[PDB]
Design a protein around this ligand. Sequence first.
Ligand SMILES: [Ca+2]
Ligand SMILES: [Ca+2]
Ligand SMILES: [Ca+2]
Ligand SMILES: [Ca+2]
Ligand SMILES: [Zn+2]
Length: 314
Amino acid sequence: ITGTSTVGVGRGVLGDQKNINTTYSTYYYLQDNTRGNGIFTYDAKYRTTLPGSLWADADNQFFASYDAPAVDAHYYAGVTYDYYKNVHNRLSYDGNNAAIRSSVHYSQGYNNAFWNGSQMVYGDGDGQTFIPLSGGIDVVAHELTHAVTDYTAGLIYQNESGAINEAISDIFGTLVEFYANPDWEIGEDVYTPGISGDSLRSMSDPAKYGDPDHYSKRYTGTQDNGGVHINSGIINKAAYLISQGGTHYGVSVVGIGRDKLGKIFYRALTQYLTPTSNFSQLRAAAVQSATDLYGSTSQEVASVKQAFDAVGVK
Ligand SMILES: [Ca+2]
Ligand SMILES: [Ca+2]
Ligand SMILES: [Ca+2]
Ligand SMILES: [Ca+2]
Ligand SMILES: [Zn+2]
């Protein structure tokens, strides 16, 4: 853990070569000392006990297939850190350079990734529905954004507040993807290696995969903790409209770009949203955020208003 900072090289899940910040002490550890209190990547070794062992490597080369998820987890955690630092002046997820820890090779054939309240966890996928989810920069940013949310708004993971929590992670997950071949889809890089052109969720058109793109169409049952991954499509659609514009259900929205989208939603996240905020309170938080930044008469406030009107959120 105490060692000499250095730079290693390896290949990611998608076979792309990347340099990665490591630490040398007998072994080369996946420990990035250049970012906050450090970014640490662990090997769970197909087990479920966490975090596992700090990834140790003999030669500082990571070209083994078994290394691939660790390379991308380590690397994309760094990119996501840079994003929040450089774009939003936030230092790590807690705002005080908290150590970012990630575990890969979690369980066997685990088709999911998550923030467990203290760290990143990535499954390898079963190789048909998913390949190792570390390969998706939007996936990585999505999960770390949960840390940001938990330390700020604190949106509980249930019903509409949970839907907002999920949406925030999709939105900033996408903005990081744009920050680093970007798009307004979620997990396309790691989802379904057999079929091309699909994804887990779409922000541009949520209904593509059965998720609501309007408040009238919202899920109200009990599964998915009240549809946190489902009803997020409603907010994801609004976020997309604010950035890219377009006409949705007859309501025209003027786009203001991704950078203003990020500034608005980040401010909403950190200044106005609470653990129990619903879509309507999010709407109000976004309108006030844009008002703070750009003025009550600005096109940015109008676009946010037209966006939530478009997805039926008053
Ligand atoms: Ca090696
Ligand atoms: Ca992409
Ligand atoms: Ca994407
Ligand atoms: Ca696919
Ligand atoms: Zn999530």
